[PDB]
Design a protein around this ligand. Structure first.
Ligand SMILES: [Fe+3]
Ligand SMILES: [Fe+3]
Ligand SMILES: [Fe+3]
Ligand SMILES: [Fe+3]
Ligand SMILES: [Fe+3]
Ligand SMILES: [Fe+3]
Lengths: 173, 173, 173, 173, 173, 173
């Protein structure tokens, strides 16, 4: 039953990899929702839409990389239902940035739990994979989101639409 | 009397094409009026003037394409008087954008009526011509105008001239 | 309440566009499942994996284009849950090709129903959009899948793994 | 019995596609006859021969495209006898142009009937195919033939051979 | 009320500039009418159509330059109705050339009256503008039209259609 | 009645040239039938379709060259009805190759009879034309078809579809 390539790969690690795949695709779905929310005629923030579409594409790559890692170690991929994003209307740019920050913090927390599980199971390859491809990216993404939120708050968002317009033109542009 | 190239071309379709030609040229005239209104020394919005001059040139092309289609199908072009635009002073940028949105919606409504007439008369070539060259352009133009109006409203226009200046420099520039 | 860009866009058309978006993303999910099924060490068909990953990326683009069309016409995007693919193990290459053919036929049937609804609602722009971007692509994809299935059956698949190997190397390679 | 790719493709549409294929090849045969009639030593109009040979090649492509469409939709091609052109001697350039105009009008009428049948059978892909690849081409070809006939009549053809010589050298050259 | 840039600009000069703008656009409309008259299948003179379309585009530029001059001097543009051309059928090439000559002579006469008014009002900038951008162009256009009419008369137009065909091919081509 | 260029050109030679033209076009029609038979979804042999389409184009050129030769020698072209191919379903690749071999042998036999007639009528130009443009081509085509048939038989065709697939990919590809 076990694959000819499976070595030092625990069942719990495989299940955690599958759950992380589902999370990464949920995050991609949420970012797509934000991106096409900012493409609305009553919102009209092109650079916000570009930023969130790029985030969605990145998360899909993260998930595809996770699926490739699952296949490499001899595990079996079990896809689940990709849940809808918790919101349909994202209010404005600052709220979308804060929701994206909350997402990334959750993805990073899940990745930290996965690394802790791999360390407990003595899987050095999985730990190195998580450290190389997912940890520093999460901290850079969280730092970037925090910078964006700080700039939006200081410019006067969300009360002033001039602030969101100028942030769209200068920072994200 | 009928031309050697006229085939499956109804009289009502020819009359509707002539009326659409007159509308497209009226729209070009209105856009020219807006463009050279924004060139005034007491207005001084160069990018608004460029945008509306480009819209005027586009509408002329639309009309010239309509005249070419009329000649291709064996119909006869009957030009009418190009009426003056309903306004001489366009108040400000937001009002001009809203008036342009109203125009385009009317041109699109006229184009939809023309397509409905062509479908009722079983003229597939005319329907395909309208769909290919005029429908998607109208929806893109209307979407762009809606985005511009939303951005202008959110920036604080027309109350704040800083908003119109920054929209001129960043969006239309 | 209605957007400033909404014109000749029916509620039923908006709902059908949302359902088509959900279908296109389900199809992308299914193609991703097939692609990373063929990346398994006990399957090892690299070109099948490439083909299905490309199909998944294409379907996402189809969905993103549908979302853009929804935003252009003044409709509102309502995302739903992306259901898991009906299978986790795809047996072999021929079975995967047949399942992909069944999917595409369903997507084409849904697109034909959407076009019929748009024609009944007299929405020429939506009909032209569906015809230009989705109908001929569906027929080309279905034709390609039928060719692949015929070649696989004639080569001796799925009984002979030599047939699947040679089809992977020569056709999909 | 039905092909694995056949979907929303009616039998009447398949028969009409076969008849259109036969017509397109008959038109190609007629154009070839005209072209090699103008290559005679007692006619000696090289540019007329080039024009009609190009028309023949175009019609063959039209037929080959029709055959490809028939194969794409799951229909079966049934070739018939290609009838000889109704004339062996084409009198002169103006008569050949008028006969070519009559042909094209017939091909366009057949294409319009085919589009009407496809619309009645609710085959949007076939309607879009006919509109995209065959309707506007027919109207451009008919317009070009009408222009050529008008120029030939005004120059003094067919009474004056100087007119046909100058039309061959300047227009078709 | 007067603009901050208005200096040595008389009200009569502003009114004459507005009337000249309306004339230049009427001339552009007339040239467009001629150009798309020569695109008819029963006329079929491509180079005449090109010539008159170029004349129409030039006259629009003349009008746009006049509007720019009006804005530069502090005057206010007041657009009027663009009257339809006096003819729908232009008979033939020679008649169209003669009508174009009559137009240009009228535009030049209006420009000469405008220059006389500016000289009487002691507006050296307006006089220099008219001399630099409009007088020599009118005399060159009138000379070219006279040459075309002389050539058409000598070749045998409008009685001989061979003359119009050869003039279209050689002179305007 | 005879043309000014007719010299040493017999009536029987002219009739044989016309019959050869009709045969060459029938062969082109048959090759087109085979090519678009192999484009079917239940056949799916792209390289067979390419090969037979190229053969059809070549035969048309052969016929056009024959028509040009007929015009050069002062003969008159008399086109006949192009008969439908004897088959609609070509079974498989080997059967199509064998039918193509039978055709070419017939075309070569007809060409040999035409050369014999020209030699009997003492027409050295016609004999040289047939030898230069048609004899060696027939023997090369027959040799190529024999090689293809031998390879198909040795690979196991038509019983093994793997043989036809590999021949399509390697030989015709
Ligand atoms: Fe990620
Ligand atoms: Fe327009
Ligand atoms: Fe798709
Ligand atoms: Fe054709
Ligand atoms: Fe002028
Ligand atoms: Fe041949």
């Amino acid at each position: 039953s076990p694959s000819q390539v499976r070595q030092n790969y625990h069942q719990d690690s495989e299940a955690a990899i599958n759950r992380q795949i589902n999370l990464e695709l949920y995050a991609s779905y949420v970012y797509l929702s934000m991106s096409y929310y900012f493409d609305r005629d009553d919102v009209a923030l092109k650079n916000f839409a570009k930023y969130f579409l790029h985030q969605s594409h990145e998360e899909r790559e993260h998930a595809e990389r996770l699926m490739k890692l699952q296949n490499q170690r001899g595990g079996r991929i079990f896809l689940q239902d990709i849940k809808k994003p918790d919101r349909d209307d994202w209010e404005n740019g600052l709220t979308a940035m804060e929701c994206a920050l909350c997402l990334e913090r959750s993805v990073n927390q899940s990745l930290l739990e996965l690394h802790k599980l791999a360390t407990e199971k003595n899987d050095p390859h999985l730990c190195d994979f998580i450290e190389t491809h997912y940890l520093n990216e999460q901290v850079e993404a969280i730092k970037e989101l925090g910078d964006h939120i700080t700039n939006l708050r200081k410019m006067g968002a969300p009360g002033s639409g001039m602030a969101e317009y100028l942030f769209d033109k200068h920072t994200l542009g």
